[PDB]
Nucleic acid binder design. Structure first.
Lengths: 54, 99, 212, 103, 41, 82, 43, 56
RNA sequence: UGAACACUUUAAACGUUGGGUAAUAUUCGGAGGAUCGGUCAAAUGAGAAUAUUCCGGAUGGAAAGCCGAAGGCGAAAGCACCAACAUCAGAGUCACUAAAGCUUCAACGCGUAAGUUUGGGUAGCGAACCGGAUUAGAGACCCGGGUAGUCCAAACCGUCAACACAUUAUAGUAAUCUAUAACGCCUGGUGAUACG
């Protein structure tokens, strides 16, 4: 029961949607990259900006 | 008898108040009450005359003692409290009540 | 110990906003000595040059010549290098040529000099004494005069400082002998609030835990 | 995000319904997938200043704290929960970090 | 303490070793200061 | 732009009495600094780096171990903010 | 470090109380009032 | 004096009545604390919350 | 250089929702029987129906009184009840990116406060309208009540010692020390108002 409480703590359900959208923002950075952890190529830039404007 | 006093001094006018322990107020005494107006009201003698009057009134009231609660930052107010101590009508209490 | 100190100086010489070349002998000869790394309040060995009736001429080596009133100067500050106060027939015959123990209050005045006064502030002697003895509780009693009583203890004027002994570390007979001098023991002080805690030396130091 | 609530309570009622009031707030935060960390009161403290300009309730008021982890959606029901009941006067809800460094 | 730092150890262990290896002059100095204290008072 | 920046900084510190002239380097600034050191307009130059914001380990300019005179931009744009 | 947060949240999830015994936790917390005259510490 | 834990976020009466609250229902300003000014401003915020709170 | 990520650190940054307040004038009953208001000084009035006050109650919204300062955040105007939502921003560390950078002709937005259209009602603030005063007339300064507006929500206006009077940016050690990149503006004074 207490581990179920820990996994309901560590979920993204509980967070403020600033932090929820930031976690799915590094999900998007894992999607759009050409690469393992590229965070500054211009595709990463426009992916962040397009999602952000949505 | 037992009385409560509120003293307010403004540059134009100075006030010492004679009131009941309940705080219901029998009277308030002012430089204006002694009839001084404007600068004379500003003057120390006007507060002193009201203070002499308040002591005479407190005796007529039969309240030998009235607590005095001070109010205001004014100089004239200070003369008035002294005049009463010199006067000897005895305060039930002497204190500053300014809010 | 020499080479490691030199390489420590050179390693901290890196990460500066200039290239800073031809300035490391500066720090080497600084590190042997030439200035002590914290100055305000630190006592020195100073050299007396001449003594007048009032103002004594004492070396600084740091802004020239120091000036101290002689009525503060005793033979106690005459730091002999052997461990004894010097055998002199009088008590203020500070002959020029001795090493003197004086404190720099500031390194520079408005008026061209430093202060550099061991004031013989006996209260500051008790300040350094009792602060060091607060440290030295982990590693002899102090006299005080009891003056008046109030709630929780007795008022003790200890060596120019007025304290207040609590009820738990107080002796019983200090109630019935108010006014006389007797020795006490320091416990602690609170410098942010100016409260000084003492005990009677006959009252045993049962462990007050260091609430911090 | 864990939320402390140093909220007020009516001073001297028999405790048969203030405990039920906290049961209601516990039911409200019980929903929405979160729960209280600790419910620590302070017994009772007389207040510093009077409140309730209508009906003049007075000081000597009671104190309760909730400390609950909640997603942000539950706050509006909690706003109703603290707003509809006239047995409570003030409520302060503060965010606290994930180090669980609560009051 | 610093030459124990560049020797490789961390700061607090160096502070402890400096407490062991120079305390003798500290009790000599505190004896000297208590002597000056009895001299002044 | 780099020529005017070089000669502007020369004009700067001559009329301001600063005897050190410090530029954002390029191919031009390096080469023509070697020119004016060769003709003796100045007495010398070195690449320097604002060493306070060097990292835990960036590359750092060792003057002794490096040969004395750089001659290209890429050796002088390897590091950070020279 | 995420494992360490996992560890100290799993081992400190008893005082983090459970949904089923709300009522008994209320009755086991109302029994003793809590100090307020000086400052409360952490928890 | 500047022990952060129990003073940084904590609104209870003891620390503030010791070193932060003026006697006449008012507060102790910046000059009478000798503390880091941003941290002082945030605990002054905490105290000034606590002058809105039912305590003080 | 410019920008996005992970940490460290920032508060009067921004809009919305709920709650509070020293304090405010009006009012419901009671104490108390002639002063209050106010100014260098004088003058309509509150008041013989009860004034300043004082008790305790209601009202309803302004503004956030101390903190708090040659302090901060801002692009600027500006921004000073909390709590929460909320969207940023800015700085430092550590990593990505390899000119996407600079300026703004044109266009376009922000824009303190007044002013107008719409809806009401309103603690205090303070143009008219009447009343009195230094003086010969007094229309002002000052005493005296006080309406639109200041308050709210939506729109229009966009101009100003809106100043670092210090264009913006880069490069040097917070510039008015000054090389450059794009700019904007001036060309003796009085004469910028009238047309379009």
């Amino acid at each position: 029961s207490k581990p179920d409480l820990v996994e309901k703590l560590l979920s993204s359900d509980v967070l403020g949607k600033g932090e929820r959208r930031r976690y799915e923002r590094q999900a998007l950075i894992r999607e759009f990259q050409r690469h393992p952890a590229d965070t500054g190529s211009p595709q990463v830039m426009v992916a962040v900006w397009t999602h952000r404007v949505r | 008898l037992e009385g409560i006093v509120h003293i307010q001094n403004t540059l134009n006018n100075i006030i010492l108040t004679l009131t009941d322990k309940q705080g219901l107020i029998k009277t308030y005494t002012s430089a204006g009450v002694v009839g001084y107006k404007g600068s004379r009201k500003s003057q120390p003698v006007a507060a002193e005359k009201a203070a002499e009057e308040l002591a005479r009134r407190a005796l007529k009231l039969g309240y030998s003692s009235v607590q005095v609660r001070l109010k205001g930052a004014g100089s004239n107010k200070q003369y008035a409290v002294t005049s009463l101590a010199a006067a000897g009508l005895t305060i039930t209490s002497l204190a500053d009540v300014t809010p | 110990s020499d080479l490691d100190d030199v390489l420590c100086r050179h390693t901290l010489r890196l990460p500066k906003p200039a290239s800073t070349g031809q300035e490391a002998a500066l720090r080497l000869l600084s590190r042997f000595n030439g200035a002590l790394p914290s100055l305000r309040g630190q006592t020195i060995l100073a050299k007396v040059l001449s003594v007048d009736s009032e103002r004594v001429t004492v070396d600084t080596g740091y802004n020239g010549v120091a000036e101290v009133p002689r009525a503060d100067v005793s033979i106690a500050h005459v730091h002999t290098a052997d461990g004894a106060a010097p055998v002199r027939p009088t008590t203020s015959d500070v002959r020029p040529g001795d090493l003197l123990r004086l404190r720099v209050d500031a390194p520079y005045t408005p008026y061209g000099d430093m202060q550099l006064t061991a004031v013989r502030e006996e209260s500051e002697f008790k300040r350094r004494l009792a602060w060091g003895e607060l440290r030295r509780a982990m590693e002899q009693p102090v006299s005080g005069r009891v003056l008046n009583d109030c709630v929780g203890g007795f008022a003790v004027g200890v060596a120019g400082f007025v304290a207040f002994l609590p009820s738990a570390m107080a002796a019983r007979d200090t109630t019935q002998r108010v006014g006389s001098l007797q020795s006490f023991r320091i416990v602690a002080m609170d410098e942010a609030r100016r409260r000084i805690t003492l005990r009677d030396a006959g009252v045993a130091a049962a462990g007050f835990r260091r609430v911090g | 995000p864990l939320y402390e609530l140093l909220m007020l309570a009516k001073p001297s009622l028999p405790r048969a319904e203030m405990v039920a009031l906290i049961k209601g707030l516990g039911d409200l935060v019980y929903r929405n997938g979160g729960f209280v960390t600790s419910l620590k009161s302070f017994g009772d403290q007389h207040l510093a200043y009077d409140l309730r300009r209508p009906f003049e309730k007075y000081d000597r008021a009671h104190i309760w704290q909730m400390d609950f982890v909640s997603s942000v959606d539950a706050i509006k029901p909690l706003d109703h929960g603290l707003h509809v009941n006239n047995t409570v006067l003030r409520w302060v809800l503060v965010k606290r970090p994930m180090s669980d460094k609560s009051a | 303490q610093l030459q124990l730092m560049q020797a490789g150890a961390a700061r607090e262990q160096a502070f402890t070793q400096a407490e062991q290896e120079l305390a003798g002059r500290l009790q000599a100095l505190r004896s000297r200061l208590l002597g000056s204290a009895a001299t002044a008072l | 732009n780099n020529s005017c920046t070089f000669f502007g900084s020369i004009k700067r510190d001559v009329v301001n009495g600063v005897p050190f002239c410090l530029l954002r380097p390029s191919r031009l600034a390096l080469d023509m600094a070697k020119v004016v050191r060769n003709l003796g307009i100045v007495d010398g130059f070195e690449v320097v780096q604002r060493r306070s914001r060097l990292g835990a380990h960036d590359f750092v300019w060792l003057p002794e171990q490096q040969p004395q005179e750089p001659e290209h931009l890429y050796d002088t744009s390897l590091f950070r903010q020279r | 470090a995420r494992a360490a947060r996992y560890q100290r949240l799993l081992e400190a999830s008893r005082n983090w109380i459970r949904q089923e015994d709300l009522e008994a936790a209320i009755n086991r917390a109302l029994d003793n009032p809590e100090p307020f005259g000086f400052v409360t510490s952490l928890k | 004096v500047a022990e952060v834990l129990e003073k940084a976020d904590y609104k209870n009466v003891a620390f503030l009545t010791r070193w932060f609250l003026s006697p006449a229902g008012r507060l102790l300003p910046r000059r009478q604390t000798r503390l880091p000014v941003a941290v002082h401003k945030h605990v002054s915020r905490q105290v000034r919350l606590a002058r809105h709170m039912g305590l003080i």
